[PDB]
Ligand binder design. Structure first.
Ligand SMILES: *[C@@H](O)[C@H](CC1=CC=NC1=O)NC(=O)[C@H](CC1CCCCC1)NC(=O)OCc1cccc(Cl)c1
Length: 165
């Protein structure tokens, strides 16, 4: 299953990483990539945005249609345990690098002194700059998003995505 162009067009450069347009008004990203000390995102003043943050998961709901070209898609509260998802990585060069990952359990991982709520997976590598890339899978004719990239071990074999749950 290959992600189509419109789906890749949801993956958006943002701060020190990326985020993802779930719908014309809803954008998700990883909390630690969000720019600090700004007055606006995508030209919209912060006061016109509903910003929800839960650990490493951040969701923006804009007051105007920012991507009216897109259909809403489903955001799951986490990825299906045991399923192979795809991480839709865009590199700064523009290279597309979809990575297959078998998802594990939602848990708290010890990461750089913090206890980070998220979901682990095993790569079937990610690098600095990739955080915020979406974890997706295809259910029938339709793609679903279930998390955003947050961390990986030195070997790259274990990844962690932030989840809404
Ligand atoms: C994107 O910012 C990034 C991705 C990354 C670096 C190396 N391989 C990758 O996929 N994330 C980090 O650098 C991440 C940042 C922390 C910040 C505090 C909140 C949690 C995320 N840290 C990271 O990947 O550290 C390495 C690590 C250590 C222990 C366990 C794990 Cl899963 C990762």
């Amino acid at each position: 299953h290959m992600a189509p162009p419109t789906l890749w067009s949801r993956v958006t450069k943002f701060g020190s990483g990326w985020g993802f347009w779930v719908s014309p008004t809803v954008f998700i990203t990883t909390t630690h990539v969000v720019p600090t000390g700004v007055k606006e995102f995508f030209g919209e003043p912060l006061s016109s945005i509903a910003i929800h943050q839960a650990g490493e998961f951040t969701q923006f709901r804009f007051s105007k249609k920012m991507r009216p070209d897109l259909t809403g898609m489903v955001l799951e509260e986490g990825c299906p345990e045991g399923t192979v998802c795809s991480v839709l990585i865009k590199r700064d060069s523009g290279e597309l690098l979809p990575l297959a990952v078998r998802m594990g359990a939602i848990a708290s991982m010890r990461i750089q002194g913090r206890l980070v709520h998220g979901q682990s997976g095993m790569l079937l590598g990610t690098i600095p700059g990739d955080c915020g890339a979406p974890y997706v899978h295809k259910r029938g004719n339709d793609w679903v998003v279930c998390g955003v990239h947050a961390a990986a071990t030195k070997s790259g074999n274990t990844v962690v995505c932030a989840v809404q749950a």
